[PDB]
């Protein structure tokens, strides 16, 4: 049975091999994909953008410049276009500062586990931070 939903069977492609695998696929979206490589690429990228959008909304009131950010992200996504379709490791484009050469693959897995839990948290947070900005129009408080 699934870890996250114990009354559900474990999804077949959600064995404990990727980071963040809580067995959470109730709708069965992973049954039709051949691999979860492209979906992890999209989960990490949505989370890394949401992590920058959380801090970008903090430092916007606690002090088109963002047109240079979309032009900078677009250059990174253009040069690493084939990596989403090569079949390579999801999220890895070699943008590490040498820290990722480190302890063994159990520690590499817990680094990926720390990223994907920060990825999943900031997507909930930037959904919350932008909705209660559009409704109440307060910065904070």
């Amino acid at each position: 049975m699934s870890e996250s939903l114990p009354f559900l069977p474990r999804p077949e492609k959600l064995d404990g091999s990727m980071a963040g695998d809580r067995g959470f696929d109730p709708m069965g979206l992973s049954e039709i994909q051949q691999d979860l490589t492209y979906a992890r690429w999209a989960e990490l990228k949505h989370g890394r953008i949401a992590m920058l959008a959380i801090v970008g909304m903090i430092v916007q009131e606690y002090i088109g410049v963002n047109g240079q950010i979309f032009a900078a992200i677009g250059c990174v996504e253009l040069i690493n276009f084939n990596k989403h379709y090569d079949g390579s490791e999801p999220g890895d484009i070699g943008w590490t500062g040498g820290l990722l050469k480190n302890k063994s693959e159990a520690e590499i897995m817990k680094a990926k586990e720390q990223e994907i839990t920060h990825c999943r948290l900031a997507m909930i947070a930037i959904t919350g931070a932008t909705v209660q900005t559009l409704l109440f129009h307060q910065p904070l408080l």
């Binding site: 939903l5 114990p6 009354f7 559900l8 069977p9 109730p26 709708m27």
Partner: protein, 172 residues
């Protein structure tokens, strides 16, 4: 071969497991509907009413949340539904019941196609209470849930009708 609750009607024959069985079912809904669905519906009707009859009794016998939010000040249990949907309140309760019921629907749907899930089984047992119990003792506690649930279904329906018809709060 004969029903226990009605010893002139035959036994309905689809109730052979199912710990709360009296052989009762005269209209034989167990003959026509799946018993995994029927027990899941009886259990869910039971534990909803167990919370509901305790929540109606508590609200009628004083006991507001403190401090009381705006719009729920002079309000009994028979008028707390519409007052809470105007305050907010039940709108958030409906949102989180919906994501629980949509996820449990995949549990009910996979139970009726196999999967070996017991009706009325979620993972929810955080305080232990089943640490290696025998199946004669597990089935006994499941009987206590169905019996107390069957009582609170008839109780809440008595409380909600009498509080609105005779227009009183729960110590009538």
């Amino acid at each position: 071969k004969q029903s226990q609750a009605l010893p002139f009607l035959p036994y309905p024959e689809n109730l052979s497991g199912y710990v709360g069985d009296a052989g009762f079912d005269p209209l034989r809904f167990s003959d026509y509907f799946p018993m995994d669905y029927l027990r899941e519906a009886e259990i869910k009707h039971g534990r909803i009413c167990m919370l509901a009859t305790v929540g109606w009794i508590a609200v009628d016998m004083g006991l507001r949340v403190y401090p009381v939010p705006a719009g729920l000040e002079g309000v009994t249990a028979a008028t707390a539904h519409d007052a809470s949907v105007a305050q907010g309140g039940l709108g958030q309760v409906f949102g989180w019941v919906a994501v629980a019921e949509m996820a449990s629907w995949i549990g009910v749907s996979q139970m009726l196609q196999g999967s070996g899930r017991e009706p009325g089984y979620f993972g929810f047992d955080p305080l232990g209470l089943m640490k290696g119990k025998s199946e004669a003792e597990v089935n006994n506690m499941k009987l206590k849930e169905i019996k107390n649930g069957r009582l609170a279904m008839l109780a809440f329906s008595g409380i909600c009708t009498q509080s609105v018809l005779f227009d009183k709060t729960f110590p009538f």
